[PDB]
From Swiss-Prot:
Encoding gene (name): malE
Function as written in the Swiss-Prot or TrEMBL entry: Part of the ABC transporter complex MalEFGK involved in maltose/maltodextrin import. Binds maltose and higher maltodextrins.
Principal cellular location given in the protein's record: periplasm
Gene Ontology BP term (one): maltose transport
Protein name as it appears in the record: Maltose/maltodextrin-binding periplasmic protein
Gene Ontology CC, one term: outer membrane-bounded periplasmic space
Assembly notes: The complex is composed of two ATP-binding proteins (MalK), two transmembrane proteins (MalG and MalF) and a solute-binding protein (MalE).
Record-linked Pfam families: SBP_bac_1 (PF01547)
Amino acid sequence: MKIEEGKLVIWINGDKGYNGLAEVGKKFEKDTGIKVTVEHPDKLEEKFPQVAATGDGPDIIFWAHDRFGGYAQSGLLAEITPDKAFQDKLYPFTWDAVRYNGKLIAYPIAVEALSLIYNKDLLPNPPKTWEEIPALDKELKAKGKSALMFNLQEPYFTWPLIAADGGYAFKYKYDIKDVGVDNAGAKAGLTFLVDLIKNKHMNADTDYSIAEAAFNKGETAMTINGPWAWSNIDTSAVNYGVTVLPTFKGQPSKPFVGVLSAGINAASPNKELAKEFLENYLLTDEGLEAVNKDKPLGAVALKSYEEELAKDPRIAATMENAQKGEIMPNIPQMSAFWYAVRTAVINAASGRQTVDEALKDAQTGSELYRQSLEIISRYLREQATGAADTAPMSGATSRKALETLRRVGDGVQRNHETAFQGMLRKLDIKNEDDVKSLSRVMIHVFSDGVTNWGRIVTLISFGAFVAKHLKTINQESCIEPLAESITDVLVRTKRDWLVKQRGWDGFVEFFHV
Ligand SMILES: CCc1sc2ncnc(O[C@H](Cc3ccccc3)C(=O)O)c2c1-c1ccc(OCCN2CCN(C)CC2)c(Cl)c1C
Ligand SMILES: OC[C@H]1O[C@H](O[C@H]2[C@H](O)[C@@H](O)[C@@H](O)O[C@@H]2CO)[C@H](O)[C@@H](O)[C@@H]1O
């Protein structure tokens, strides 16, 4: 087993107070003898699922809660079971953020939302609207300054504007069928952003470091950032305020709210130690103070300490932005959603694609898993049972993709029956455990090779062949898991290619009669 027993390794992002966290570790080590190592790897949110899948990684991972449902769905996190008395020390809505499929999958630490950060010496009155920023920038450029710089590389920072006039990720329970990435609100916000770039009020290449340095040196009047940033601003002696984000088309900017949370690796042989550290050392007044003093956490989950911090006007502004925003969903398709929108924003800002092209692709990318599952699940089930699903189907594409797959998929099963049968007789499929062991095979087979529509039809057509078998041996319950497996394999390893082909519209086009 890869993770070492008798110590704690912790991963946390490099913008958080990891020196403070290490101080809490020192205190844990003092009491118990157990060494605590804090690390801050680049791209840790993409690295964790890769390493944890193989049984490796940190004992504890810290991230906003949006990534944790994906982790939990993949079996990477231990269920946490604090008692009533500990649960009652934290705000109920923070626990809701870390609930997935009825189980608690992490400990909530703190509530974070973006705010408008402004230099009070340059801009005694910050703008109320995004619409007035171009004029303010022109005024400021005549004095050697700029109005606003913020990270354009990460969609978390552009999202408040995109969402203002109507963009949304997943509607309201969260409806995974209803995605608002390329609606009219979304387009208007992204367009306003690209116009700021086109008119030289911002630069498409601005990232976290460039924006932070410009603000902290007094060269730009505003930035958009989170509570973590306030420490470095204090160091710089900029006279800053923290306030409400500007409105767009009369409506508030809607930041996605995150709950910084701590999850325990399912492979860790140190779960009792991790729970003891998190509950009795970190999530205490002193523990959170030590972290907070290094980089501010925002509104902490711990009611006792939150009451002390609540008086701070920067925190009050954070909560006001948070109330106008929306708690991020934690569903497993969040990762895909962020990856598509990141790409959309970068390509739109750079002029690689137009706003319409960019957000079209993002909408495709964000809907891809669900749309694929629907198609694949329907085809496997109808093949296995001999009757189609009567529920309505998005709808036109799905219906036509299913019609196409019925032609080409039946061809493949028919002409390749003997290899199919042979490969299904080799494997001793008879229950959910074997199907479990199929993705593995499919992952090494499907990936290793060319990516084209024929190889995709092959995977799905073999899927159907298996489903038929499953039905005859009264293992019908295993079909939907089979469809989820095939779908995951397809959309994880071929996402970029699929988005390039216009998704399933492409599939319909390619095999068109
Ligand atoms: C779960 C297995 C999967 S998943 C999957 N995904 C994409 N493509 C696949 O196959 C195509 C090539 C191919 C086209 C047409 C029919 C078979 C395969 C490819 O990899 O490009 C597969 C196979 C696969 C891979 C190999 C096979 O056959 C392997 C060779 N023989 C060995 C002897 N035995 C009797 C039959 C299988 C068989 Cl029977 C399947 C379903
Ligand atoms: O930009 C997409 C990104 O947004 C959020 O990440 C935030 C994070 O929540 C904050 O703690 C801070 O570190 O900045 C990050 C943005 O760079 C999501 O939590 C994340 O999953 C998503 O990829």
